[PDB]
Amino acid sequence: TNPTAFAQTTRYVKDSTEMRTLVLNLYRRYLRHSRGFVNNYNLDIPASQVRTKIRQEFERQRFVKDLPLKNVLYMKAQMEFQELVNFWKQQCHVMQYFESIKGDSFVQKFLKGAQ
Amino acid sequence: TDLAKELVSGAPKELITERVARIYQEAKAATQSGQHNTETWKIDWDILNKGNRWENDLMGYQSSSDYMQGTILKFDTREGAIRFAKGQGWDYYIQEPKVRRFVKKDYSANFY
Amino acid sequence: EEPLPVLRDLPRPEYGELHAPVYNPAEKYKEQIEELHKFGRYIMGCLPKFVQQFSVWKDELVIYVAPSALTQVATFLKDHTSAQFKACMDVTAADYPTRTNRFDVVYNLLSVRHNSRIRIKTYASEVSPVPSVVPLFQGANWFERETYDLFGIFFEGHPDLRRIMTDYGFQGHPLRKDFPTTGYTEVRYDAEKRRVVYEPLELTQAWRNFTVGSSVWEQVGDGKDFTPESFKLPTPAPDP
Amino acid sequence: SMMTNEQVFSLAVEKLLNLEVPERGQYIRTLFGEITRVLNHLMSVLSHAMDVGALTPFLWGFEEREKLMEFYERVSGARLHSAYVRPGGVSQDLPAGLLDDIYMWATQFGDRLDETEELLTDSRIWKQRTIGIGEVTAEDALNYGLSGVMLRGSGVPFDIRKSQPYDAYDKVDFDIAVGTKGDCYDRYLIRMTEFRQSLRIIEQCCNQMPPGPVKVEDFKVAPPPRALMKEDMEALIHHFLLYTKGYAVPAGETYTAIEAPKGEMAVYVVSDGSERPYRCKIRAPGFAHLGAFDHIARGHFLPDAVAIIGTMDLVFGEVDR
Amino acid sequence: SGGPVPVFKKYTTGSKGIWEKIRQLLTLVPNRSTGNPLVKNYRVPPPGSQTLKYKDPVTIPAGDIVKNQYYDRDHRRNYPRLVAFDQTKVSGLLTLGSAQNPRISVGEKGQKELAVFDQSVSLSSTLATIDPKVVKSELLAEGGSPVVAPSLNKKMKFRLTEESEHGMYPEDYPIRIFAQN
Amino acid sequence: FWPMTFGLACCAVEMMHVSAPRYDQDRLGIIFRASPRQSDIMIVAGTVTNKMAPALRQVYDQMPYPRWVISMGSCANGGGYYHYSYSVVRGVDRIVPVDIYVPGCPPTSEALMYGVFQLQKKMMDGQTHRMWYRSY
Amino acid sequence: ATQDLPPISGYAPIQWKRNLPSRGFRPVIWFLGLCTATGYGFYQISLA
Amino acid sequence: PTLALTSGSIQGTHPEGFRLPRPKTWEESSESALSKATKWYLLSEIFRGLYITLEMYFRAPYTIYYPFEKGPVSPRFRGEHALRRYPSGEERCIACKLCEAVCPAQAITIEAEERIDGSRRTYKYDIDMTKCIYCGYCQESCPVDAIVETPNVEYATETREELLYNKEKLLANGDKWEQEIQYALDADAPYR
Amino acid sequence: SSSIQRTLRNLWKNGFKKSFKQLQGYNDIKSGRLVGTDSFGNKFYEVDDPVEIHMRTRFVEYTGFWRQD
Amino acid sequence: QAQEILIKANKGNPTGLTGLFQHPSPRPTLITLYKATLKNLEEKIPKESVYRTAVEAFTKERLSIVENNEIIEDIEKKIGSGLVEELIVQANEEYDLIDKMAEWKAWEELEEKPLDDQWTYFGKKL
Ligand SMILES: CCCCCCCCCCCC(=O)OC[C@H](COP(=O)(O)OCC[N+](C)(C)C)OC(=O)CCCCCCCCCCC
Ligand SMILES: CCCCCCCCCCCC(=O)OC[C@H](COP(=O)(O)OCC[N+](C)(C)C)OC(=O)CCCCCCCCCCC
Ligand code: SF4
Ligand code: SF4
Ligand code: SF4
């Protein structure tokens, strides 16, 4: 049994410094494949917008401190990277991923029903 | 305990910022003398103030948008329920079960 | 040349009032229960450092170990001559939110050599790692992938761990007890977007919870004791 | 193989319930267990031959499926999804005349198997598509969790009906075919022998079918008869509670496996003392077989993959349960 | 043994007269059936027109009106209990023996030894300081021989058979037939 | 009448028995085609999952007109046994337009043939070229 | 009688072993027929 | 004493003759090279397979001419649902809600109250035919045989809405199919 | 069952008009003894011909000529 | 020293098990594996280990059978653990297990105790 393309062996990193390098290495791989993501899935946005989106998602977990949470977050990011590069996702999923979009006042929610 | 396990659970953010769960022990039914259901601690979610239930006009079905409306977790101890709720970062509150006061009961008291 | 007989018209036997034995089905396992107790104790004696405890139910033996002891016990149960469990038939998990470690990771081994089956039980949390038995059993590759997909258990050392059942980009682990049975979202075809899109879940008829009708009385008692006499702590002789 | 799927779950619940099926019930699940096995092998082998290019044997055997599915519908009312085998016995007793109709089919089914082998067994084209294709060593078959024909094709004589007998399989005589080369052609030959051995078992079940109840004589698990329900106070209560609350199963867990036509099918059921299972892990032999596809089909050509898929007897409902 | 059977003994529609003689001449295997069920025998009484009068079968010990106390046959509530053996209880069984072969002192002197295994007692320490004959007789079997994994069915044997017995493919085909033995 | 080989789940087994000698769909001119280009009938026989829904839509769009869709079984009609599942589409009509619904779990081989007969009755009532003359 | 049961004597035995007897002449006869046909065929070709 | 001395077992003991014999070489063939070549060149088994296929060409086929002919049916067959009546015309169902509880797919919706005359009757009985798995649990659980499954299968509909049966549709089905249901009941009731 | 002699016997028994209607919907020429008629008008027959196969001893004659339901 | 010993032959007559070939020197290979196994136990594993006690008991029994039976069938019929080709595989795996057991130090105290609530199911402690 040979592992699929871009498959990494799951490993639990016990060093916080080493974990930072692995995230940085994975961060560059996302940026390098940004044009490939545009070509494979036929997106309506340029590769520059994809890299902005990738940076925004990475910055959402910048201030995560717990090392056990980092390993799960890094592992799922590797799985997401493998899914995109190998064209396993359908083009509809990637289109909706970039189709993500001042809140309403109290009265505006009140008049319509709110939640 | 302190770990924010909701960051990796995959559940939507609305479970934390918009929903309230109740940790409670089921009260004894007034129509039955059994107490088996009162031996376990359970967690359920408060209903949505709107959209919890509405009537479908085609067939009279009970339509809903609350995906947690039918979820009831089972726990063996109160501490386990609190630890799980804290682990998932849920907004919760505990309803302390009512305890029955003990009163001596004998057949002689029917005349004395 | 003869015609075939009409099976309908053939005579049939006449039976009076039938009789049948009345015995506990657990009685037929008396040899299996005692033999597994001795074999389960032999494994603990061989591995006191790893075997936390063992249990025997009828013809099923379960070995309970820590996550740090999974590799050693599985290696012993695979290569020892007396216990040649070369086949790992299943790797599964179960969710127990009450405990500090939610998940019980279960390994069912088969020994075609001695016609025996054994079970290995360990525990995991949402973030704690579990050693991967893929190097030992190559058939556990897909089972561990399925366990992660439906539970989220961290299998360290898996050559290629990813989703195997859920849709690409699925959020959540369905077999967790806190995961709603209907999920969070649903799909439909959007005419404007000319494609299938995910939308928040709305049910025309909400799932009705009839499980609240469970009995308010306990149904099964404390059961009967079937422990072999050779595995009960002795009672000391009375006073002189 | 619908009725075998019900049997493994029924056995798991019965073992947890500490109950035993009566003698006639066990024979019925054995009789329809092998009728189910014949149905599965008819779908498995002929579709495997159809994928290779043999279209005609597929049509011949699918009429035999119609005759056997009529037996499914006669005892349950459903051609395919017959919820007949239930924890504690079977849903209903055999209708009168079923055994005669089963036997009349049995006297003829032997010729259908021989005519099937006329086009495949000694064909040079068929052997060039199966001999040496998808070879699996005995060492690797165990390590990948292969079972059934996949395991027995590599020289390992292991069968659950012999390793752990269940439901009157210990009261019938049958043989197991074991391969030597571990390729597709050996597995085809084994599945044809299992065809005749299943027909051998079906004949014995017809002759040795005993009288008696078909479900456990315990109304707290098995529904009472309708006539007794409408006359007896206790029968009505048990009928009411079995259909509204169900029956509670003592707390515990089990791992029950049966020799399914696909291989080893097992269920890991966890009970909490309630009327609903706490966990039900379903072990699919096809799920394990497909996990070894990469290890088996590497180096072969594209048409060999189609043969390897067919020789594993893959149903993706079982795989994706 | 399921040897060849003549065509007229199988419940299928066959040929008659001259057409039967022609079939025997032209068919390679004349004893094979056409597979068409007999219209005059197969399913002639339909399941909805059966004349059998069905009666519910009941056994005497478990389905009678007398001598039929339910708790005598209540196997569901007499299920085996779940018992787990940790290293503390195994050490107690190893040191004090079992109830089948007691090796525990009598009276108050024996209850002191029992109370030792009410807290954590490692099995490795127990094995370190113990008479080796106990291990060879209780933990091990047959004077030190290892405990082999017990079989799920001790009657699961096999024997190699030849074509004249099982009637399957001859010896030149790459499969073999194993009987019950 | 050329359907497309699109068997998903147990409903497909009954679809195979329509091609079996007992019913012999080929006697009515029914041939199953492996490519959407050569097929004008789409028989959704099985459960449609969210992971499968985009593939079903793409295959449907690749069929040249005129094209019809048949929904067979409870899964394709409204989800059936898996209606309240997290990964099951509650009816194939959420993705593609359905011309006829065949009930059953599974629908019998005669139930499917009856549904095909209903569709053929609808097709014989088409007035495509008279619509151009009178309605346009 | 009040159930579905086999006859008192039981059902007659069925055929379940392999029944695929060989048919045709020996291969040498077919080879001779091919050579005889080839010989006679070339004879008529030569005459023409 | 057993095979534990050598760490063996009865199950692990291969039977006599388990080891394969030595494979044959080219000098040990039973058939001559000319005989093996004649079969190989003249396609002996291929013509044998052709002859068997031609035999079926002169046999009766299995095809039945649906819808002019129908396949076999049994009284236990499960098809379209119906609500039945007593011979006096009164509805059999007492709105006991057993079928709603058993239903594995939760395809049954029941609402009930006291009738105008005081009878325990339902005023809303819905079955989602697109949700039902046609499993017969509702028929088994009915204490008055009110809900049954007719042997009918030819009710495919143009629109999915038509597969949402209310009480009026189910009662009409019971009146329409009462005679056929009586056929099945008279032959299957003793076995229940 | 597929013999031409069976078709000729059924053609003679039925007649031209009856057989031609079968040649339009039935795709087969069949004859049988009348069993009865339903409220809709369909006629039902049973076949006594020994050469008919198991599942083809009963059939219906629909009222319509071009379409059957 | 360098005692290079063949465990699994890659060629030769088949044994009836796919991928398992006949061993050219059945008896001599088992003798060296058994004797090396006994020596390795006495140098790595302490005496009080139950694993060491059990392995010596059966390794000597299998060594005595190999050294007293010239016929291959009689060796298998008394050990009862498969063919001799399979016995060589078992001897190699048992030899390697002893080396892993020595590194694990699996005869010491329980390395990790379970929690108090660990093996409890629905309120009942196992
Ligand atoms: C005449 C021109 C038309 C036919 C040409 C081809 C005929 C076969 C040639 C090779 C025969 C061979 O090699 O014969 C040998 C084989 C097998 O016999 P075996 O294994 O040696 O038997 C064992 C030894 N016995 C003989 C003592 C028992 O016989 C066959 O399988 C004959 C096939 C007959 C069925 C098909 C015949 C009609 C074909 C379809 C119509 C075109
Ligand atoms: C001198 C007389 C000349 C005779 C002329 C005819 C020769 C025919 C070919 C013979 C050789 C052969 O069929 O060979 C078989 C080849 C190659 O097989 P292989 O890889 O070598 O294995 C076999 C060798 N063994 C056993 C030593 C390992 O593949 C095939 O199965 C080809 C199948 C083609 C079937 C087409 C039939 C169509 C219907 C025809 C009837 C109307
Ligand atoms: S509707 Fe029923 S038969 Fe059809 S695919 Fe779904 S479960 Fe299977
Ligand atoms: S047949 Fe089964 S699934 Fe259908 S309505 Fe009745 S109980 Fe529900
Ligand atoms: S089970 Fe019968 S009586 Fe009870 S609610 Fe359903 S239809 Fe009515």
Side-chain angles (χ1 to χ4, degrees), chain D residues 157, chain E residues 158-160 178 181, chain H residues 13-19, chain J residues 83:
Chain E
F158 296 108
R159 60 181 183 93
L160 188 58
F178 292 82
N181 185 88
Chain H
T13 298
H14 290 322
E16 183 188 18
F18 177 78
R19 181 181 297 269
Chain J
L83 302 180

Side-chain angles (χ1 to χ4, degrees), chain C residues 98-139:
Chain C
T98 85
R99 316 181 309 188
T100 308
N101 304 281
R102 297 179 54 182
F103 306 105
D104 270 357
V105 190
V106 180
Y107 302 83
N108 290 269
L109 308 181
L110 171 61
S111 181
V112 184
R113 250 300 181 275
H114 312 288
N115 189 15
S116 62
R117 299 180 180 270
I118 204 183
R119 190 179 309 170
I120 302 180
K121 263 191 174 179
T122 177
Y123 46 90
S125 71
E126 309 179 22
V127 292
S128 65
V130 172
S132 186
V133 297
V134 171
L136 294 176
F137 307 96
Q138 299 296 141

Side-chain angles (χ1 to χ4, degrees), chain D residues 124-125 128, chain G residues 34, chain H residues 40-43 45-47 50:
Chain D
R124 64 182 71 183
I125 305 179
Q128 285 173 288
Chain G
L34 173 61
Chain H
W40 186 67
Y41 269 103
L42 297 185
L43 315 173
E45 78 291 328
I46 296 180
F47 284 104
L50 289 165

